[PDB]
């Protein structure tokens with residue numbers, strides 16, 4: 001699918017965007033392309049703490065329920081409430097308007113463990129090739 005360079009990725013197909021002292025999380029284009037039409041998004045509550053590797057919400061498609069794992073840890077400060085109304089933004093704008101949450105990174109260096117665009121692309125290739 002389509003990959004962007006200014007982001008750090010997770011094997012479970014989530015992306016992060018570091019900007020000063022905040023991280024914007026969402027799911028990649030490869031993810032939505034594989035999920036199919038997204039029909040519902042269940043996001044966490046503000047103030048709640050997310051943990052690296054643990055699920056914070058879920059995305060439902062016409063076929064299934066896909067739990068989204070937080071790529072890093074932090075406190076949720078913001079949530080895209082527009083997704084409840086327009087779940088489709090995930091399919092149409094995964095990297096921009098399809099943003100799910102905004103967190104205060106509690107352990108910033110966790111971003112080092114995160115893959116880059118090229119690293120992720122190779123990854124997506126390997127996973128697609130295992131079929």
Ligand SMILES: *C(=O)CCCC[C@@H](S)CCS
Nearest residue numbers: 013031034035061063064
């Ligand atoms: C169909 O909905 C099955 C789940 C697809 C999820 C994506 S992230 C699979 C990537 S190989």
